[PDB]
Amino acid sequence: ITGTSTVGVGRGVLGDQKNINTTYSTYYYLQDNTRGNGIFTYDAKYRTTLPGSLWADADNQFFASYDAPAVDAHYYAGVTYDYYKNVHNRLSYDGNNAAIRSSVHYSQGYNNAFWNGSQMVYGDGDGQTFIPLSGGIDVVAHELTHAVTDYTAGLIYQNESGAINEAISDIFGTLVEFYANKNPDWEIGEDVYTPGISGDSLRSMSDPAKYGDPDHYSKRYTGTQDNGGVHINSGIINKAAYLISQGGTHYGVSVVGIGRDKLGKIFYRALTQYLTPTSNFSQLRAAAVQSATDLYGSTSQEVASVKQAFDAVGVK
Ligand SMILES: [Ca+2]
Ligand SMILES: [Ca+2]
Ligand SMILES: [Ca+2]
Ligand SMILES: [Ca+2]
Ligand SMILES: [Cl-]
Ligand SMILES: [Cl-]
Ligand SMILES: [Cl-]
Ligand code: NA
Ligand code: NA
Ligand code: NA
Ligand code: NA
Ligand code: NA
Ligand SMILES: [Zn+2]
């Protein structure tokens, strides 16, 4: 819609207060005009027809219980856009400042979020397994990163390609969560998962086996469920990226970390220059060694830690 750019205030899913970019034309809309061609948050109104209706508000104040998931989807979309712009010089997910669209209140008691090929969508949860899923920044950045992957490497959402697709989204969702600060960790979804049960999360990168996910190639899932285990075998790659950033010993192999920023530089170069729709873990190993050599040199420390971490998770 067209109007004047303004700034509202609202409260997020976890009860914090934040400023959001809005647009005024009779109503205030959840339309951030400051970032590329815009950030648009919609109300799905407990249905599954998408996108629904652009979020309109009467007074530019977003403190209603109904408003909190919209506040966070709008806000964390903006933070993720700022991450990709300021750290990797990507203008939105296509590199050309595409519009970012999100719907909230999708369905009833819907315990997931996803990228549907065109927009993000967030359920409210059922209040015991999940609270509204946009409340977690690593969730929002994870889902947005599927769009980045679709537009670059194009990783097929199945078998090893899909575990890589999944692991990339976890990696950058965490890197965004660190970038914004606010209690960063190597866990996925701890902020919106199982209200009333502290300490847990959907997935762990530091130790994926805490939730039964493989942390080594020998332990890979080889069957039918979850599109060939794309949410399960991602633990193998998630552990490698953890080892690369923070270092550690894992199945006897010791790895020295090179920090968050360098994990980012190297994996972004892998995704946008070297990965193909059908890459598997071994090509992911080679792709990541090349970026390290590209950015740091044939005999860098960086090429060394990459090789080690993949040795540590058993990827040849
Ligand atoms: Ca209001
Ligand atoms: Ca956290
Ligand atoms: Ca996290
Ligand atoms: Ca919990
Ligand atoms: Cl309502
Ligand atoms: Cl998905
Ligand atoms: Cl997903
Ligand atoms: Na703020
Ligand atoms: Na801002
Ligand atoms: Na299934
Ligand atoms: Na640590
Ligand atoms: Na060389
Ligand atoms: Zn995903």
CATH number at residue 118: 3.10.170.10
What is the Å distance from ligand 12's center to 292 Cα?
11
**Are residue 138 and residue 18 in the same domain, yes or no?**
yes
Ligand nearest to the CA of 183: 2
Q: Could you tell me if residue 161 is left (phi over 0), alpha (psi between -120 and 50 degrees) or otherwise beta? A: alpha
Alpha carbons 187 and 44: distance in angstroms, whole number:
28
Q: Is residue 1 part of a domain?
A: no
Experimental method: X-ray
- Helix then strand then coil, % of the chain, to nearest 5: 40, 20, 40
**Are residue 123 and residue 245 in the same domain, yes or no?**
no
Residues belonging to the active site: 143, 231
**Are residue 310 and residue 161 in the same domain, yes or no?**
yes
**Are residue 223 and residue 284 in the same domain, yes or no?**
yes
**Are residue 149 and residue 285 in the same domain, yes or no?**
no
Question: Which sign does the torsion angle of CA 213, 217, 218, 223 carry?
Answer: positive
Tell me: is residue 150 an annotated ligand-binding position.
Answer: no
Structural domain count, the chain: 2
Tell me: is residue 177 an annotated ligand-binding position.
Answer: yes
Q: Which letter does DSSP use for residue 134 in this model?
A: G
Ligand nearest to the CA of 167: 13
Alpha carbons 250 and 23: distance in angstroms, whole number:
51
**Are residue 179 and residue 41 in the same domain, yes or no?**
no
**Is residue 138 a contact partner of residue 123, using CB atoms and an 8 Å limit?**
no
What is the Å distance from ligand 1's center to 217 Cα?
51
Tell me: is residue 226 an annotated ligand-binding position.
Answer: no
**Are residue 85 and residue 167 in the same domain, yes or no?**
no
Domain boundary among 110, 138, 154: 154
**Is residue 39 a contact partner of residue 81, using CB atoms and an 8 Å limit?**
yes
What is the Å distance from ligand 4's center to 235 Cα?
20
Q: Show the domain range for 290.
A: 155-315
What is the Å distance from ligand 1's center to 11 Cα?
11
Domain boundary among 123, 154, 185: 154
**Are residue 143 and residue 226 in the same domain, yes or no?**
no
**Are residue 216 and residue 180 in the same domain, yes or no?**
yes
Q: Is residue 131 part of a domain?
A: yes
**Are residue 68 and residue 175 in the same domain, yes or no?**
no
Ligand nearest to the CA of 142: 13
Side chain identity at residue 141, one-letter code: A
What are the CA-CA distances from residue 187 to residues 61, 173, 216, 286, 315 (Å)? 32, 10, 18, 26, 22
**Are residue 182 and residue 277 in the same domain, yes or no?**
yes
Q: Is residue 133 part of a domain?
A: yes
Tell me: is residue 190 an annotated ligand-binding position.
Answer: yes
Using CB atoms within 10 Å of the CB of residue 259, give its burial: 0 to 12 exposed, 13 to 18 middle, 19+ buried: exposed
Tell me: is residue 187 an annotated ligand-binding position.
Answer: yes
**Are residue 79 and residue 187 in the same domain, yes or no?**
no
Alpha carbons 287 and 266: distance in angstroms, whole number:
9
What is the Å distance from ligand 10's center to 111 Cα?
14
PDB resolution in Å: 1.9
Alpha carbons 9 and 19: distance in angstroms, whole number:
5
